[PDB]
Amino acid sequence: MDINWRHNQSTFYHFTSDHRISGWKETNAMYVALNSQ
Amino acid sequence: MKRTFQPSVLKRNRSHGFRARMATKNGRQVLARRRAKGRARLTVSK
Amino acid sequence: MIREERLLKVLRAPHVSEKASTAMEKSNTIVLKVAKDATKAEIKAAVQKLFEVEVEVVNTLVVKGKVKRHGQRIGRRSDWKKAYVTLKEGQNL
Amino acid sequence: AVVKCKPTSPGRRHVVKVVNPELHKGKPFAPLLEKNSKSGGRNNNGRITTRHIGGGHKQAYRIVDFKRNKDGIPAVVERLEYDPNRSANIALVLYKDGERRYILAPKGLKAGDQIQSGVDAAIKPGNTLPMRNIPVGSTVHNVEMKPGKGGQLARSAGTYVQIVARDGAYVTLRLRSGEMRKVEADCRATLGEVGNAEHMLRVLGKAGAARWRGVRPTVRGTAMNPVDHPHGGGEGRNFGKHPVTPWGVQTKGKKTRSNKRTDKFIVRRRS
RNA sequence: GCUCGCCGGAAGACCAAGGGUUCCUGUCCAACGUUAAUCGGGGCAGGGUGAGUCGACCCCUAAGGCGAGGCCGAAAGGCGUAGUCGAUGGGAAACAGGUUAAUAUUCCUGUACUUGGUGUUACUGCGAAGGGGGGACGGAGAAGGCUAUGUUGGCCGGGCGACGGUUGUCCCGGUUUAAGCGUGUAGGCUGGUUUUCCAGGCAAAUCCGGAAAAUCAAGGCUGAGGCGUGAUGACGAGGCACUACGGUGCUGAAGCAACAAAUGCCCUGCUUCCAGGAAAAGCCUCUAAGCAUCAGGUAACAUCAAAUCGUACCCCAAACCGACACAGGUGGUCAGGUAGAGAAUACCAAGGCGCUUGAGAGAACUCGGGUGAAGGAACUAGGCAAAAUGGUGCCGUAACUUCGGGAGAAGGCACGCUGAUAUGUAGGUGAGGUCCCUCGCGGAUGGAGCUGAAAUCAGUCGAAGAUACCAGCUGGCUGCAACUGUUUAUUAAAAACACAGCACUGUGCAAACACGAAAGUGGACGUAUACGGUGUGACGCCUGCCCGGUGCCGGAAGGUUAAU
RNA sequence: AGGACCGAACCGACUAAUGUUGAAAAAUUAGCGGAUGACUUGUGGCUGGGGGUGAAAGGCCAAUCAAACCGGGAGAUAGCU
């Protein structure tokens, strides 16, 4: 359980996805930034 | 959805197996580092 | 011919179970654990010459070892080989 | 015979076929066939060296006799056949000693027709003979460039070469290019012109026809990004550059012959 | 255990890949199981995988890998000849029934087949990393002959029935049988046989190829299925005797015919079309060197051998890939009934499941749905969403057009059930009988029986007959793109990319060009009617002027101009 | 006959709604496009990082791409926090 918890905390450490906050969290930040311009 | 690891034993061995690490200079250096690090399984054979 | 020094090392134990038992009491076959590298000619010759009976035919399977564990330490047992030795009409053991 | 297809279903609207009722409907002659594996445009390094190649139909190679070595033995043309490896058709011929061979089919040549290779051959279309024995001003195909080597000039369909001069040990040849070239006069050549001229009149009609001759699509350079082709980029259509190959060498004019070894043999370049 | 619901071209069954004991039995409930658990793919122990014929190994090869020498390269190393590996392909042979808690084309019963070794006997020219054949192989389409399978009748066994009727044009069930061996059919292909001669198959050849004759008109090859045997056997609905009520033994009737019919088989066929459709071995043949009263070949018989590894279990999934017992992904094989064109869809059979939290209540609100007065786009960025349309036959159908289309334009009418025509027709199939015989798996006649649309007329029911499920909304003007396609895996499917077609330009073959310190390889076993690059992008009418700038091509006089 | 027409398997992904600490690190449901072809799919092989491949989007190259991943130079450098 401890090994699975360390690896499953280590899941989104090297991500790329920009529309999702922290790799996973859905948001509207594309529209927020885009409307700020 | 179709994930990346679609397993096949024959491609596992032809690709990353022992006779294929020993077949060249750099794979032999791979085996040398795995033995020197001291590793329970060197290649992926079975 | 097969040398007798080879031919003694092949048979290892009689196999006791209920499939073995019904094979003896129903179809003349004695079931026995053999050497892992033992061929059917060696098992046939070794039952011909070590229990002095007449063997009709041998059928050999290989049984795979079970991954047990002690505490939190695993381990596979060990593969063995099992020979179904079909005798002729005149036999005892 | 060229035939416009009737325009049922687009795709057939613009097709022109070149049908030939005198070609053999059936299997080719087997012991002159061999395996011809398709490459994909890719060398022994795996890399695409010639682009736009790949796919298409499976083809078997046909050993065509370009040398024409059986001298003095006559041969009757057994039949004409479709060859997938060429523009022209091939004639299967039967020599008098019982040996069949495929030759390139010249223009007039039908089934049941005598051809004959060698020095003392009659001058009539289909006979391969050395060019010191052919008259000046004769159409001639399947020309050798070195004696004994095999034919390499005028092999593609509807193509001939005219012999214009015999100055010494050399014959001046008007190649189909328009180029005047000197060839050694001991080089064999086959009389007549090679015979499927109407090949150039076909029109293919759709995209998949090109695809089934093994010609993958051609992405044009200006549609790419600047990292890909020198033409690249630009906010809608934007050319602005002198037109080049994908490797920067000028297309549209720039001469790319450098031989210096065979410049002796070129009397006049093409125009 | 009885009911109820769900899947049933799957949510059933069998595998491959992958996993690796999860399989089966006994036992335990700590943790694992999104709850409880006596249960479990969990814990512990024991058991379980049986092969000459299935698969692998093996023989042969494709793509491709590696590669003695070799060519090349500062070194490492690249390429590659001989060779050697490499299946996803080619190559010998087993089927039915029974059995275990758990394996079975493997065990048992019955009946078989294949390939090698050895021995005997009879005849005898055998012999290759060599020659020839063969293996040997496309897309589409069309029927014909069959079968699997199903339906109905006959037969056999059982029932006469909780509620009106049900001894009959009644109800329920069964009606199965293989490989192998023998026969040779519906098809399909090909003229056959004998003699002589030859510049071909590196040599030889009796084989192949070729050229002459002569004669006969048939022979040969291949082939589904049927039929006979296998099989007076097995299986069989059910009864009988004991019954650790789990079953265990014994016995066991009929076991036929008609019709329908595949996407399976004849068929690697046939017809056709361009886009012109693997290789090598096994296999059959020919001989060379050699061996020639020997060895070897062929045939019969006998005898021996056929090793090794896989075999459990899941396999559209709780066991594989997805961190999960995850609403996802995952190749092949089998494919019953009724309605239906159908592998759609509805309801079902075989079979398998009810999705590992439940009990209530019946607020707002959210989600998935049903219906809605009058109105009917007034909503809105925009008819988004929903509603509507929806089948088959027949009538009918405009502009425009590349003469194909548009077109299912548009718009209509008919549709159930019953009866008659006709105790079910037209059609399909086709027995007994009869006739002939080159006599049988034959052809001619004949129509019993079975199957069976579709139409008209008459009648009848309902508000409604394409009644459910399933199943086009239509028309008008216009921009872009000719069209089918492709693309931003994961906010962009588009007018963008592609395209056929056009043009310009390079390229004479050791081609230009590309990958490569090089060797080499692709271009291409191609040769200018070809190949590469660039732009434009079907088709129709067309494509005007400018060479001063930048580029390219050509010129060589003069100026300037490096190493030396 | 057909890069032909309608339409399942099969391939895809146009719209809407849900979901958005999901059942799911891209799906479900209802409609939707192709569906004999430039199709689709299984098994194997080949191409590799300024390199591949690209019907071209800077797309894709193991949930990573205007230059992959791993290890090293390496405690880079950071007048900045």
From Swiss-Prot, chain B:
One of its GO terms (molecular function) is structural constituent of ribosome. One of its GO terms (cellular component) is cytoplasm. The keyword Metal-binding does not apply. Keywords: Ribonucleoprotein, Ribosomal protein. One of its GO terms (biological process) is cytoplasmic translation. InterPro entries: Ribosomal_bL34, Ribosomal_bL34_CS. Belongs to the bacterial ribosomal protein bL34 family. Part of the 50S ribosomal subunit. PANTHER family: LARGE RIBOSOMAL SUBUNIT PROTEIN BL34M (PTHR14503:SF4), MITOCHONDRIAL RIBOSOMAL PROTEIN 34 FAMILY MEMBER (PTHR14503). This is Large ribosomal subunit protein bL34. It comes from Escherichia coli (strain K12).
From Swiss-Prot, chain C:
The keyword RNA-binding applies. GO terms for molecular function: rRNA binding; structural constituent of ribosome. SUPFAM superfamilies: Ribosomal proteins S24e, L23 and L15e. InterPro entries: Nucleotide-bd_a/b_plait_sf (IPR012677), Ribosomal_uL23-like (IPR013025), Ribosomal_uL23/eL15/eS24_sf (IPR012678), Ribosomal_uL23_CS (IPR001014). One of its GO terms (biological process) is cytoplasmic translation. The keyword Oxidoreductase does not apply. Pfam families: Ribosomal_L23. Keywords: Ribonucleoprotein, Ribosomal protein, RNA-binding, rRNA-binding. GO terms for cellular component: cytoplasm; cytosolic large ribosomal subunit. Gene3D superfamilies: 3.30.70.330. Belongs to the universal ribosomal protein uL23 family. One of the early assembly proteins, it binds 23S rRNA; is essential for growth. One of the proteins that surround the polypeptide exit tunnel on the outside of the subunit. Acts as the docking site for trigger factor for Ffh binding to the ribosome (SRP54) and to nascent polypeptide chains. Part of the 50S ribosomal subunit. Contacts protein L29 and trigger factor. Might also contact SecE and probably does contact SecG and SecY when the SecYEG translocation complex is docked with the ribosome. This is Large ribosomal subunit protein uL23. It comes from Escherichia coli (strain K12). The gene is rplW.
UniProtKB/Swiss-Prot annotation, chain D:
GO terms for cellular component: cytoplasm; cytosol; cytosolic large ribosomal subunit; DnaA-L2 complex. Pfam families: Ribosomal_L2 (PF00181), Ribosomal_L2_C (PF03947). Changing H229Q: Loss of peptidyltransferase activity in reconstituted ribosomes. No change in rRNA binding or assembly into ribosomes. Residues 27-52, 220-271 are annotated as: Disordered. The keyword Hydrolase does not apply. SUPFAM superfamilies: Nucleic acid-binding proteins (SSF50249), Translation proteins SH3-like domain (SSF50104). GO terms for biological process: cytoplasmic translation; negative regulation of DNA-templated DNA replication initiation; ribosomal large subunit assembly. Residues 38-47 have a biased composition (Low complexity). GO terms for molecular function: RNA binding; rRNA binding; structural constituent of ribosome; transferase activity; zinc ion binding. SMART domains: Ribosomal_L2, Ribosomal_L2_C. Keywords: Acetylation, Ribonucleoprotein, Ribosomal protein, RNA-binding, rRNA-binding. The keyword Ribonucleoprotein applies. The modification N6-acetyllysine is found at K241. It comes from the Bacteria. InterPro entries: NA-bd_OB-fold, Rib_uL2_dom2, Ribosomal_uL2, Ribosomal_uL2_bac/org-type, Ribosomal_uL2_C, Ribosomal_uL2_CS, Ribosomal_uL2_dom3, Ribosomal_uL2_RNA-bd_dom. Part of the 50S ribosomal subunit. Forms a bridge to the 30S subunit in the 70S ribosome, contacting the 16S rRNA. Interacts weakly with S6 in one of the 3.5 A resolved structures. In pull-down experiments interacts with CedA. One of the primary rRNA binding proteins. Located near the base of the L1 stalk, it is probably also mobile. Required for association of the 30S and 50S subunits to form the 70S ribosome, for tRNA binding and peptide bond formation. It has been suggested to have peptidyltransferase activity; this is highly controversial. In the E.coli 70S ribosome in the initiation state it has been modeled to make several contacts with the 16S rRNA (forming bridge B7b, PubMed:12809609); these contacts are broken in the model with bound EF-G. Belongs to the universal ribosomal protein uL2 family.
